[PDB]
Every structure is written in structure tokens, then in C-alpha cells.
Amino acid sequence: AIQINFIKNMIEETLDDFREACHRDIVNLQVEMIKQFHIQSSEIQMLLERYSLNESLVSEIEKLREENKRLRANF
Amino acid sequence: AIQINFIKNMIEETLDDFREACHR
Amino acid sequence: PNVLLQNLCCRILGKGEADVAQQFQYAVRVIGSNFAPTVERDEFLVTEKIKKEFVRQRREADGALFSELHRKLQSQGVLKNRWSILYLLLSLS
Amino acid sequence: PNVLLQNLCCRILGKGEADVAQQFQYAVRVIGSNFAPTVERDEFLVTEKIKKEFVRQRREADGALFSELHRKLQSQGVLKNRWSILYLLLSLSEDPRKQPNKTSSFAAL
Amino acid sequence: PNVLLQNLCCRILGKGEADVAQQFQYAVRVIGSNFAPTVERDEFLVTEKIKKEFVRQRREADGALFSELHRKLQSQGVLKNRWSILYLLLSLSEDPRKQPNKTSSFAAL
Amino acid sequence: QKSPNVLLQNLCCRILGKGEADVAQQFQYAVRVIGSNFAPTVERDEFLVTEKIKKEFVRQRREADGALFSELHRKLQSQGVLKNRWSILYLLLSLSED
Amino acid sequence: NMSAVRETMDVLLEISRLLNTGLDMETLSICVRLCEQGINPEALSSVIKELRRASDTLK
Amino acid sequence: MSAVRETMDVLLEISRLLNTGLDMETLSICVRLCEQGINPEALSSVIKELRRASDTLKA
Amino acid sequence: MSAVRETMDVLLEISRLLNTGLDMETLSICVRLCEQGINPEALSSVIKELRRASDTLK
Amino acid sequence: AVRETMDVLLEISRLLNTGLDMETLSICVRLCEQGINPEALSSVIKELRRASDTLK
Incomplete structure (x- = not known):
């Protein structure tokens, strides 16, 4: 048991070092993941937005307001 | 004490192979 | 809690805002993901793991000094949960 | 930093500048997502590891040779992160007795 | 390869000759991703894992039998893709133990 | 009745401490999680699970309570209403607390 | 039948509490x-x- | 055709075991x-x- | 705030190590x-x- | 500096x-x-490297 107590301690400590280092990495994947969901959600939204509200829409909206008020001006 | 070191050294060898495996 | 999270975010990037709205929203996202502690209220072990890491970096003199600093906190008896802050220091070790 | 990555993509793959696109979007994203280093500033574990690799490839002679060239890098005083190039080489090691998957038109599968 | 994977989908489901389009689309995605398999080529290494697996379900007589079958297999045809088939089967093994739950009410949740 | 859908809602309603229709938003989220597959760490042998529960009792410094657990186990086996004892046993083991 | 299910519950319930x-x-x-x-x-x-976690954040 | 069939047959022996x-x-x-x-x-x-998709479908 | 700062000095030191x-x-x-x-x-x-975001950027 | 280093690294890769x-x-x-x-x-x-393989 004297030989054993020495060995036993060594072994547990190195398996713990492996568990704490591996643990830290898995915290980094999880974080990297969430962050990427944030980034891609910002990106897709932005590229989407430009065309959804494209110039084609903007011009015809603009056109509609100015005309309706000028009409009522002549009535 | 040499007998402890001997076991220590062996254990280190198996953890290194696993580290690189876990890394892959 | 919400504003204490917002303050922290501004301070780490450098004091005063300069388009850090996104970074605060990102941290709100992180805090809404449920993580799970490995040990809870076992402050003594969290000190022991730090020390094992300091031998691991070959920075053993730092490891003697850290023991004095935790013992300081232990005497003062401040309530916040001592384990919470130490667990923060372990992740950054 | 970007310019460097673009030069890696364009050069190896050849000039599509729109057919080397994939690697480039891939590249910026992968490096920007932060993680804390593992196998860093512990060059002793890395040298030993490459020697085992040689031992495995049935080239005992190349391991003593390697050790000599390794010490030659130290004296130059250049290349801040030595470990990272060594780490890279080891990943892509292969034994002289097989060869890993090569196929093309993988999109079809 | 498009034909082969589509036929793969249709066969397993035992029906659906253009209704398995959705499952197909997924399969094309998974295959288009990349892997790094732990143990890459080399016939000895895969045979050793298969024998351990045989012993573990308590099918000893089968472990001994398989080894003759492996030498036979080789003799009948020689590939560089031999290992990929043996590793494929390995991963795709099934345990005899337990019921594999219900599917007659598990569908509904 | 007791269809899966009806039982998962009742569970959510009481544990979240909010009404039936007011736990919906979490109710949908709950369906995705269960319909994404996992596989237990212990897959083979009913005994492998039991010994684990028994080891846990010792660890918590509650040796006496693990003896009591063996006795309960015989009771469960003899009545035979359940045919997936293991699922129930792995599930409480996981939700163990101090 | 009613009795039997109760006992089945009863034993499990004892284990959950321990x-x-x-x-x-x-x-x-x-x-x-x-x-x-x-x-x-x-x-x-x-x-x-x-x-369980979401309920604590709410209350 | 002869060579191919003979690896498969040896291959089907392993698969069933x-x-x-x-x-x-x-x-x-x-x-x-x-x-x-x-x-x-x-x-x-x-x-x-x-495989899983097929079983659920049939029931 | 005085008590919070006193604690804060102790954590600042640990952070240096x-x-x-x-x-x-x-x-x-x-x-x-x-x-x-x-x-x-x-x-x-x-x-x-x-903190890492701040260092890589600058 | 970059070149001098590249030759020694080139030796290692070949091994x-x-x-x-x-x-x-x-x-x-x-x-x-x-x-x-x-x-x-x-x-x-x-x-x-794998991209280059698939591509050609």
C-alpha cells in the first residue's frame, strides 16, 4: 500500500489535468457556436434587407405620397 | 521511488496519444 | 443584473461606448444559454486546481503567493459567494 | 492579416477569384472565432511527439536528423511560434504504406 | 454517385421513388461535409477492433470465424479502399441487447 | 387518455409554475429536444445501471439508503407493469441531487 | 389493478426521495x-x- | 462480374455475423x-x- | 463601494499572477x-x- | 529570415x-x-489542401 499510495496520487492528478483542459475546450466550442449564430443572423438580415426594401419599392412609395397631397391641394 | 517514476512515465505516454486524438 | 452585464461589456473593450450595442446583445445571448457548473460551493478544491495549473505552466512562485491572497479573502468573510469568483479565475488559468 | 489568407487561397488553388471563394469565407471566420491555446509554449512535448511519429513510419534515422535541424532553428532567432508549424506537419503525416482519400467531383456524392 | 445515393435512400425506406427527395438532400449534405477518422487505412488495426467487439457481445465463435473470412476476403479482391468498408461495417454494427424501444408511439412525440 | 403530447404539456405546466397555454412557448422547445436523439452512456446490461446508483449512494455518504434501494428494486421486479425499468432508473440517477 | 399501480408508484417514489x-x-x-x-x-x-432552470429565472 | 460477386458473398458473410x-x-x-x-x-x-425514418413511417 | 473596492484590489493581484x-x-x-x-x-x-477581442483588434 | 527558415522547414516536410x-x-x-x-x-x-484535391 505504500507503493500504491504514491502511484495513486500521480495518476489521479494527471487524469484531472486532462479533464480540466478538455473541459475548457468544450466551453470554447459552445461559446464559438453561439457567437456564430449571432454573426450569421446579423449578416443574413443585412443582405436580405437591401433587396426586400429595394429601390423599386422606395420610388413607388415616394411617388404615391406626393401625388395624393398635391391632388387635395387642387381640391 | 524509481518504481513510482516508472509507472508515472508510462501513464504520460498513454495520455499524449489521447490528447492528440481528442484534439483531432 | 441587466445593467451590471452592460457595464462589464463597455469596460473590457475600453470605457465609453463606440458601437458596443452588439457586444452587449451577444453577451445576453450567452447568458440565456444554460451552462451547468462542475462543482458548486467547493471553493477549496478550486484553489487546489489553480495551484496544479501553476506547476503545469512552470510558474510555481506565483502558486505560493496565490495561497496568501485566498487566505486574505477567507479572513474578511465578505458575502457574495467566494466560490463564484474563484471559479472565474480557474477558467482564466 | 486578410491579405495573407487571400494569398494562401488564390495561390495554391489557382486563380478563379470566385472559385477560391469557399476557402476565403472559411478562413476569416475560422481564425476570428477565439479559443484559448492548447499545445503552446511546451516545445518539449512536440519534439518527442514527432520523434514517435518517425519511429512509427519505420524511419529511426530521420528522428536523429530532425533533432539536429531543430536546434538549427533555435540559433536563427526568427519565427515567433515554432510550435504552430510543427503542429501542422504532424497532423498531415502519413505512413509510407497507404495513402488517404483522394476523390474529385465530391459535390455529386 | 447521384443515382447510387438516391437508390440507397429509396431501398432502405422500401418505397418512395421521388418522395425521399428531402432525405436525399440531407444525405448529399452530410457526405459533402468532411471527416477525419480516428485510424486511417491499414488493415491490421481495424481487424483488431472487430474482434474486441465480437467478444464483448459474447460471440467468441464468431470472432475466430471472421479472421478466416478476412484472409479469404483479401484473396478474392484487393483494394485500397478495403479498410473503409471494414470500418464502415464496424460503426454500423448493432447490439442484440434491450428492446429498441417502441416506434409505434415514439413517432407521435 | 395519455398520448405523449398531452402528458408533455402537463409536466411543463406544473414545473414552470405557469398556466397551460402559458407554458406553450417552452412546450415547443421541449418537443425539439426530445425529438433530437441521444444515447445513454450505459447502453447494455440492466445490472450496469443498478451498480451505478449503488456507487452514487456511497459517494454521497449514504450507505444505509443504498441497502434500502436494493430492497425496493425486488419489489419493482416482482410487479411487472413496467418493461423498461432501466429508463426510469437512469432518469432518476441523472436528476440526483444532494 | 388500482392497488398494483399504486405499489409500483410507491416504490419508485421512495427511491426518488432518497x-x-x-x-x-x-x-x-x-x-x-x-x-x-x-x-x-x-x-x-x-x-x-x-x-427547471428557466423556472428559477422567471420566479 | 465473377470477381466482384465473390467479394460480395464473403462480405455478406461478415455482415450477417x-x-x-x-x-x-x-x-x-x-x-x-x-x-x-x-x-x-x-x-x-x-x-x-x-433506417430510423423507415421504422417510424411503417407504424 | 469602499468594501467592494477592497475586495477588487485582492482580485486585481490575482489577475496579475x-x-x-x-x-x-x-x-x-x-x-x-x-x-x-x-x-x-x-x-x-x-x-x-x-478581453481577447480587444487584444487581437489592437 | 523568412526564406532561411523555409528551407529548413522544407527539409522537415520531406521527411x-x-x-x-x-x-x-x-x-x-x-x-x-x-x-x-x-x-x-x-x-x-x-x-x-483537401479543397485543391476535389477541385481538379
């Missing part, structure tokens, strides 16, 4: 019914922890 | 894809989702 | 977050990633 | 039976000196 649980008898009943109806043990364990 | 639980026809497709280069890990994964 | 730059201001804020019973694991994920 | 180009290693020195994690550097290049 191991410490936050579930009541009603919820515990529901879990078993899920067990019989299929449902690998890990998915069930996970959905519970996330739902 | 090792408990693959796949069909003959399907295995030939698995082997053709390998010889043309596929990753093994991906290939088992696809098989698995398809 | 591991060799991480943190402002004094951030070390005070961490204290508020654990008194409120904030999850230390979410907390660390914030500290790690935003 | 491992691992093909890398002259150019890759030189760019690598540039990335290191700016700061790159060892995992990242390896991962971009490993994928870039």
Missing part, C-alpha cells in the same frame, strides 16, 4: 408513462434540467 | 461508393437516419 | 454579478471573449 | 512524406508573427 428530487408525485407519474411509451433516458433528463 | 442488419443490395451500393472514395463516418451516419 | 490584463472597473463589476447569484460559467465566457 | 509548398511555409511565418493560435493555422491549411 436520491432527492424536486419533482412531485404527479410529475413522477407522467415520467413513467413516458418511459413505457418509448423515449431514450437522456432526452428526458435534459428537457427537465432546461425547464 | 457482425450484426450490421443491412440488406444485400444496399451493401453493394455502400461498397461502390467507397471504391469511388467516400468517408466511412458520414456514410454510417446517413444510413442511420434513413 | 495569471498574467491577464483587466481594468479595475471590470473587476468591481464581477462582484455585483456573483452577489446577484449570476452563473460563474456564463460570466467567464463573457470575460474571456471580450 | 514526413507530407507535401506542402514553398510558398505556404513563408506565409505561415507572416501569420505567426501577427499572432495565430497553433490549432487555427493548421486547420485552415489542412482543409485548403
